[PDB]
Design an enzyme around this catalytic site. Structure first.
Site, short mmCIF file in Angstrom:
data_model
loop_
_atom_site.label_atom_id
_atom_site.label_comp_id
_atom_site.label_asym_id
_atom_site.label_seq_id
_atom_site.Cartn_x
_atom_site.Cartn_y
_atom_site.Cartn_z
N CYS A 44 -6.21 3.35 -5.13
CA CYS A 44 -7.55 2.79 -5.35
C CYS A 44 -7.51 1.42 -6.02
O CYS A 44 -6.98 0.45 -5.47
CB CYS A 44 -8.39 3.76 -6.19
SG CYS A 44 -8.44 5.47 -5.57
N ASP A 92 -5.47 -8.34 -0.69
CA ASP A 92 -5.76 -7.12 0.05
C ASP A 92 -4.43 -6.39 0.28
O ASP A 92 -3.86 -6.42 1.37
CB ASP A 92 -6.46 -7.45 1.36
CG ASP A 92 -6.96 -6.22 2.07
OD1 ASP A 92 -6.73 -5.11 1.55
OD2 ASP A 92 -7.59 -6.37 3.14
N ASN A 95 0.87 -1.17 0.00
CA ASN A 95 0.00 0.00 0.00
C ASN A 95 0.91 1.22 0.00
O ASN A 95 1.48 1.59 1.03
CB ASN A 95 -0.95 -0.01 1.19
CG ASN A 95 -1.94 1.14 1.15
OD1 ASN A 95 -2.25 1.66 0.08
ND2 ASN A 95 -2.41 1.57 2.31
N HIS A 153 -12.43 0.90 0.42
CA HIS A 153 -11.54 -0.25 0.52
C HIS A 153 -11.60 -1.05 -0.78
O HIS A 153 -12.68 -1.47 -1.20
CB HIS A 153 -11.93 -1.12 1.72
CG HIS A 153 -10.96 -2.23 2.00
ND1 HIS A 153 -11.30 -3.35 2.72
CD2 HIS A 153 -9.65 -2.37 1.67
CE1 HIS A 153 -10.24 -4.14 2.82
NE2 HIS A 153 -9.23 -3.57 2.19
C1 LIG Z 1 -16.13 5.39 -5.91
C2 LIG Z 1 -15.29 4.36 -6.66
C3 LIG Z 1 -14.61 4.96 -7.90
C4 LIG Z 1 -13.72 3.93 -8.54
O1 LIG Z 1 -12.78 3.49 -7.92
N1 LIG Z 1 -14.01 3.52 -9.78
C5 LIG Z 1 -13.30 2.37 -10.34
C6 LIG Z 1 -14.32 1.39 -10.88
C7 LIG Z 1 -15.23 2.02 -11.92
O2 LIG Z 1 -14.45 2.38 -13.07
C8 LIG Z 1 -16.31 1.03 -12.33
N2 LIG Z 1 -17.27 1.71 -13.21
C9 LIG Z 1 -18.43 2.22 -12.76
N3 LIG Z 1 -19.32 2.86 -13.55
C10 LIG Z 1 -19.11 3.04 -14.87
C11 LIG Z 1 -20.00 3.70 -15.73
C12 LIG Z 1 -19.63 3.79 -17.09
N4 LIG Z 1 -20.42 4.41 -18.00
C13 LIG Z 1 -20.23 4.33 -19.33
O3 LIG Z 1 -19.28 3.81 -19.92
C14 LIG Z 1 -21.31 4.97 -20.16
C15 LIG Z 1 -21.92 3.95 -21.12
N5 LIG Z 1 -22.42 4.75 -22.25
C16 LIG Z 1 -21.46 4.70 -23.36
C17 LIG Z 1 -21.86 5.83 -24.29
N6 LIG Z 1 -23.24 5.64 -24.78
C18 LIG Z 1 -23.63 6.85 -25.53
C19 LIG Z 1 -24.21 5.40 -23.69
C20 LIG Z 1 -23.72 4.31 -22.74
C21 LIG Z 1 -18.44 3.26 -17.56
C22 LIG Z 1 -17.53 2.61 -16.75
C23 LIG Z 1 -17.85 2.50 -15.43
C24 LIG Z 1 -16.92 1.82 -14.55
O4 LIG Z 1 -15.86 1.36 -15.01
C25 LIG Z 1 -15.90 3.24 -11.32
C26 LIG Z 1 -14.95 4.23 -10.66
C27 LIG Z 1 -16.15 3.23 -7.08
C28 LIG Z 1 -17.38 3.49 -7.68
C29 LIG Z 1 -18.17 2.41 -8.07
C30 LIG Z 1 -17.75 1.10 -7.89
C31 LIG Z 1 -16.52 0.85 -7.29
C32 LIG Z 1 -15.72 1.92 -6.89
#
Ligand SMILES: C[C@H](CC(=O)N1CCC(O)(Cn2cnc3cc(NC(=O)CCN4CCN(C)CC4)ccc3c2=O)CC1)c1ccccc1
Ligand SMILES: C[C@H](CC(=O)N1CCC(O)(Cn2cnc3cc(NC(=O)CCN4CCN(C)CC4)ccc3c2=O)CC1)c1ccccc1
Lengths: 337, 339
Positions: free
Chosen positions: A15, A273, A10, A256
């Site tokens: 993240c 972890d 770590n 986490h």
């Molecule tokens: C708080 C942390 C943040 C984090 O650490 N992460 C890493 C993990 C993380 O990346 C996972 N993740 C989540 N939500 C997403 C939403 C989209 N949407 C699109 O792609 C749009 C689709 N559109 C394409 C265009 N079209 C016109 C219409 C359709 C894409 C990727 C992700 C995605 O990769 C989020 C951020 C957190 C949040 C949440 C969970 C786990 C940790």
């Protein structure tokens, strides 16, 4: 290393990164190809390929947690801000792009496409006149909608759902003018290694900020996907085996981050972890990450017919003496500093 | 390449043991995969032994009809029966392996052949009545086992490392010490993942002044523990070996019958490779029925170290062949098909 496997330190707020690194490290065919890259002439600091060879080598040999400062320096994400600005697949793409470029022209060119690339077709079909536009597209990963979805299956159903273009959103059909149409996408191929991100972080227009959805979302240890192929292939059905579950607890980047893996694909799971790697039950790796604020945001499936190839033995035989000598000298110099 | 998943090699002339060795090397999957990696793009299509071996391996892996070897024999110059009657099977193996090892120098897969086939031994002469000793470290890629008067592999290894006494009219010349009583022997330091054992069945007979094949029974096991014969063992990696291939011959000259038995995955499911005909067979036919005692017996055994088995026999698929290499071979089959 009481599991055979060692952790990642770590070091700062990175993240999802340590979770992604283990995931890639245990994609053995990838790991093996990464050791074959000619990096002898690369700057030891600016080179992402070398920096990945280093981490992998350390993960394969160190009995102590493995550092990553040189890796984050190589691609310039040295601040918590960098991770807050990218989704996990964007980091993945940075890493695989660098490596795929470095293998062009070598023994192992094409390894990344062979492992992670799939093909789909997007279409627009006019309903009342004879006009159709098809567009083949490549994908290295898939973003799955989970809000309102109970499980991966419904998520794929939704992914290939036909959208209707009418009313104010009629399709500009060129010579035909504004036309009612249907839009969608179909899977032509699925790659040996299937990276699925779950769209848990969704825009809430009220706060003008992203908000993690913690709703329950179920995924199976075994994923049949033939029913989502345009044409299926008897003698190689699209049956998939869960390999990794990348998990986040909480609501923000201060949460986490852990990953679960059965590295050999045999259903014997471990929790990674950071520096603590430990055996866990199958239930904790799978159903306990269904949600309903601890849950999965990315799953890695391996195609069953590919499992023995993607997870082939990778040993010390597979590291060129030249590479090993440079990594070993570099460690001796660190130990001196 | 229908009943068995494996395809045969044509009987194109009198190449004796060559097809047997080609199958043996082809199913050394770690070697195959490295052979595909060699940079032969600029090689002469017909003078390159490495290219010629990528060709046969590629054909062995994709073709449904038995595979030819004429470009291969032409490439290293063994075009007559005389060339085969002048060399032991391991000399042919060294010609094939040395070529591919040299072609791999300076590349991603440099050192593949030593990694796979090379072990370490020490030969010594020790004076008994004076403090003088000479040690000589040597590499080895294969081992010639004596069988005459030996019941099985174990007695052959015991004999291999036995202490010879140099005394009487055979004292060692100890230089400054003059003639000296001594004993000389050999010790194994390491055994390679892939162990090639030749059986010394073709022995010179003083009378007829001639080599004669010995058909004496000689037993060899499916599981071979060799830890006894190491100077120093390793508890984390015992020297236990699994039988992979059995090269066999019937008859009393090079006009005889050459066959090889393999369990290519190392799981004890054996096939018989009889040039163009490959067929499932019993473990007994592949092992005990080649013990000797008209019938074929073993002249060469290939064992694989149990700890190394999943590595040596790793999956090798069509995606382990560079696209540049596939198109060169495909463009060649098309020219052949046009006659
Ligand atoms: C708080 C942390 C943040 C984090 O650490 N992460 C890493 C993990 C993380 O990346 C996972 N993740 C989540 N939500 C997403 C939403 C989209 N949407 C699109 O792609 C749009 C689709 N559109 C394409 C265009 N079209 C016109 C219409 C359709 C894409 C990727 C992700 C995605 O990769 C989020 C951020 C957190 C949040 C949440 C969970 C786990 C940790
Ligand atoms: C008729 C056919 C012929 C044939 O097709 N082969 C291929 C298989 C073949 O090569 C197998 N083979 C391999 N190697 C051998 C090596 C030695 N001795 C040494 O070379 C070591 C000499 N050291 C002794 C100790 N000294 C301190 C130092 C010097 C003796 C016999 C054989 C031998 O028979 C024979 C020829 C036939 C014969 C027989 C069987 C099966 C077919």
């Amino acid at each position: 290393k009481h599991t055979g496997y060692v952790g990642l330190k770590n070091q700062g707020a990175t993240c999802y990164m340590n979770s992604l690194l283990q995931t890639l490290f245990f994609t053995n065919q990838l790991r093996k190809a990464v050791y074959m890259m000619p990096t002898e002439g690369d700057d030891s600091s600016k080179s992402v390929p070398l920096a990945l060879q280093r981490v992998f080598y350390e993960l394969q040999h160190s009995d102590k947690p493995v550092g990553t400062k040189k890796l984050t320096k190589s691609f310039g994400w040295e601040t918590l801000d960098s991770f807050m600005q990218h989704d996990v697949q964007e980091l993945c793409r940075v890493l695989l792009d660098n490596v795929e470029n470095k293998m062009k022209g070598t023994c192992v060119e094409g390894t990344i496409p062979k492992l992670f690339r799939g093909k789909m077709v997007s279409y627009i079909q006019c309903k009342e006149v004879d006009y159709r536009s098809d567009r083949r597209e490549d994908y290295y990963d898939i973003q799955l909608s989970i809000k309102g979805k109970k499980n991966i299956f419904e998520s794929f159903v939704d992914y290939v759902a036909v959208e209707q273009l009418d009313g104010d959103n009629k399709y500009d059909a060129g010579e035909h003018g504004l036309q009612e149409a249907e839009k969608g996408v179909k899977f032509l191929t699925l790659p040996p290694v299937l990276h699925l991100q779950l769209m848990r972080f969704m825009y809430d227009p009220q706060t003008d900020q992203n908000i993690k959805i913690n709703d329950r979302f179920e995924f199976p240890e075994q994923l049949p996907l033939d029913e989502f192929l345009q044409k299926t292939d008897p003698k190689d059905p699209a049956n998939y085996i869960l390999h990794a579950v990348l998990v986040h607890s909480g609501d923000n980047h201060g949460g986490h981050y852990v990953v679960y893996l059965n590295p050999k694909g045999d259903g014997k799971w471990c929790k990674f972890d950071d520096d603590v790697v430990s055996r866990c039950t199958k239930e904790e790796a799978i159903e306990h990450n269904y949600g309903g604020c601890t849950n999965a945001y990315m799953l890695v499936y391996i195609r069953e017919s590919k499992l023995s190839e993607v997870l082939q033995a990778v040993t010390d035989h597979d590291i060129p003496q030249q590479l090993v000598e440079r990594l070993q000298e570099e460690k001796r110099i660190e130990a001196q500093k």
